[PDB]
Amino acid sequence: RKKIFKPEELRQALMPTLEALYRQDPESLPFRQPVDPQLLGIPDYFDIVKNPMDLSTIKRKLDTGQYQEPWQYVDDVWLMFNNAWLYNRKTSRVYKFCSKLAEVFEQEIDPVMQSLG
Ligand SMILES: Cc1cc(-c2ccc3nc(C4CCOCC4)n(CCOC(F)(F)F)c3c2)cn(C)c1=O
Numbered sequence: 559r560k561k562i563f564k565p566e567e568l569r570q571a572l573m574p575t576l577e578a579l580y581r582q583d584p585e586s587l588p589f590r591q592p593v594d595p596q597l598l599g600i601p602d603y604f605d606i607v608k609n610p611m612d613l614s615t616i617k618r619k620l621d622t623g624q625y626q627e628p629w630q631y632v633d634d635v636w637l638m639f640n641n642a643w644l645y646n647r648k649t650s651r652v653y654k655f656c657s658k659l660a661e662v663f664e665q666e667i668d669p670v671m672q673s674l675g
Pocket residue numbers: 587588589593598600641642645646651652
């Protein structure tokens with residue numbers, strides 16, 4: 559049945575899944591803040607990645623009630639992953655670290671989504 563989710567319900571359910579990503583070391587570090595192409599020396603980045611996303615931005619959106627439904631949060635986490643797999647070479651640390659975060663996220667999000675429905 560279709561359903562209305564309160565901002566605090568989503569925060570309580572979903573913030574632990576986000577913290578599970580932030581706990582990963584070494585893999586979470588490049589995902590903690592928005593990519594800064596100038597600092598990183600990669601001026602092509604915003605030419606390739608049209609809709610940047612990162613953990614800090616997702617955390618803020620959860621804290622400020624910007625998700626109405628859990629799939630919107632899942633979509634942002636996957637936008638972050640897809641951006642990293644699009645831009646980075648397959649041998650790079652960021653690409654392989656992304657793959658690890660996707661494994662962790664898949665494990666954490668499943669029982670939480672069952673709980674929200
Ligand atoms: C999603 C994404 C993220 C990055 C990205 C973001 C932050 C990074 N900080 C570092 C270093 C730099 C100097 O010392 C501290 C770590 N790197 C370099 C890689 O280091 C690491 F592998 F350990 F993370 C950063 C990279 C870059 N692109 C292109 C992204 O797509």
